[PDB]
Amino acid sequence: SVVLPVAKRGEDILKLIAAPVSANELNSNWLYQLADAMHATMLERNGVGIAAPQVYISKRVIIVASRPNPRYPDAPEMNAVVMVNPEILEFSSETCLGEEGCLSVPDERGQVERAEMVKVKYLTLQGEAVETIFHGFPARIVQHEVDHLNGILFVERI
Amino acid sequence: SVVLPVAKRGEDILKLIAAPVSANELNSNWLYQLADAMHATMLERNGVGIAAPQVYISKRVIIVAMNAVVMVNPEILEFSSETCLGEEGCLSVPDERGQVERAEMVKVKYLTLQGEAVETIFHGFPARIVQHEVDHLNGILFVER
Numbered sequence: 638s639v640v641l642p643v644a645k646r647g648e649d650i651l652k653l654i655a656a657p658v659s660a661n662e663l664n665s666n667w668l669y670q671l672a673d674a675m676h677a678t679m680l681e682r683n684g685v686g687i688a689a690p691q692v693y694i695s696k697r698v699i700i701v702a703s704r705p706n707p708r709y710p711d712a713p714e715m716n717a718v719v720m721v722n723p724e725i726l727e728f729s730s731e732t733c734l735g736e737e738g739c740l741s742v743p744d745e746r747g748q749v750e751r752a753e754m755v756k757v758k759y760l761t762l763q764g765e766a767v768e769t770i771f772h773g774f775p776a777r778i779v780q781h782e783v784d785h786l787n788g789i790l791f792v793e794r795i
Numbered sequence: 796s797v798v799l800p801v802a803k804r805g806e807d808i809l810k811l812i813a814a815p816v817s818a819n820e821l822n823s824n825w826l827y828q829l830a831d832a833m834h835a836t837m838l839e840r841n842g843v844g845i846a847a848p849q850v851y852i853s854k855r856v857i858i859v860a861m862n863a864v865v866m867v868n869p870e871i872l873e874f875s876s877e878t879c880l881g882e883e884g885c886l887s888v889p890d891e892r893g894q895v896e897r898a899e900m901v902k903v904k905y906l907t908l909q910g911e912a913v914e915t916i917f918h919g920f921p922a923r924i925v926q927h928e929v930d931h932l933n934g935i936l937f938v939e940r
């Protein structure tokens with residue numbers, strides 16, 4: 638497993654709209670190795686999520702994990718979910734502020750208003766369609782990672 | 796092997812300075828799979844070279860086709876003051892063709908996929924292709940020449 642270099646705020650890769658993964662990439666050693674290298678990168682930095690743009694890959698691939706911490710002690714321990722072409726279908730009206738950091742903004746942490754719950758549809762690495770509702774810290778991480786795919790850093794939301 | 800979608804002129808990705816490949820990535824399954832997908836994409840499009848930004852990867856990896864050479868972190872160290880005009884096309888600017896003045900000889904330092912430093916000189920057509928692909932790593936399309 639490879640740890641990849643991470644783009645920092647100021648780098649233009651972080652401001653693009655990432656390109657969808659095409660059907661012929663699904664269920665490929667190419668997509669498995671990309672997910673594996675993203676996963677190894679997130680763990681090396683003690684992250685709970687990562688988006689492909691952060692490792693200079695302008696593609697719609699994110700990982701969402703969760704672990705309990707100071708700010709959310711009842712946050713689940715959740716192993717990496719790889720989400721290909723994730724789409725948030727619905728944001729809850731209920732909104733709560735929560736502590737965020739970013740691998741691309743290692744200097745700063747902040748309070749961000751996020752939907753308490755999001756309905757998300759995505760493809761597995763195999764190309765299987767999944768629809769899940771995320772709540773709480775994992776909802777926040779999914780919103781943060783989709784923002785990365787859309788060229789948005791959390792500091793722009795404070 | 797995977798054929799990757801190709802960025803077209805107008806996409807911001809083609810206008811960045813691609814990031815160097817890190818020592819971590821050298822001799823990795825990740826880097827071989829990247830080179831294979833780039834190679835498959837080039838062949839499927841009938842191309843004679845490709846750069847990683849063209850497949851939405853902002854990394855300094857190019858292929859030049861002679862059997863294809865993959866070059867990681869290439870740098871043009873030496874070139875002829877003597878220029879040649881050759882017809883160019885681009886996978887990222889479909890159905891566009893133009894004469895571009897290039898150095899007729901280039902000496903290129905690069906890493907292999909295994910991560911050993913190597914030097915090669917290209918003349919003529921492969922020299923034009925190297926210069927075109929290094930331009931892609933620096934956010935330049937051939938139309939701007």
Ligand SMILES: O=C(O)C[C@@H](Cc1ccccc1)[C@H](O)SCc1ccccc1
Pocket residue numbers: 683684685686687688706736737738739740741777778781782785
């Ligand atoms: O930059 C990233 O995408 C990784 C962030 C994800 C994140 C999103 C929302 C809320 C918190 C984190 C990294 O995990 S930052 C490190 C971190 C870890 C746990 C809690 C807070 C910050």
Ligand SMILES: O=C(O)C[C@@H](Cc1ccccc1)[C@H](O)SCc1ccccc1
Pocket residue numbers: 841842843844845846882883884885886887923924927928931
């Ligand atoms: O955009 C690319 O990098 C791929 C081009 C490379 C090229 C650079 C300089 C001169 C010619 C080609 C593709 O091979 S374009 C298709 C093509 C093939 C043979 C001759 C001309 C154009």
Ligand SMILES: [Zn+2]
Pocket residue numbers: 738739740741781785
């Ligand atoms: Zn982030």
Ligand SMILES: [Zn+2]
Pocket residue numbers: 884885886887927931
């Ligand atoms: Zn080109």
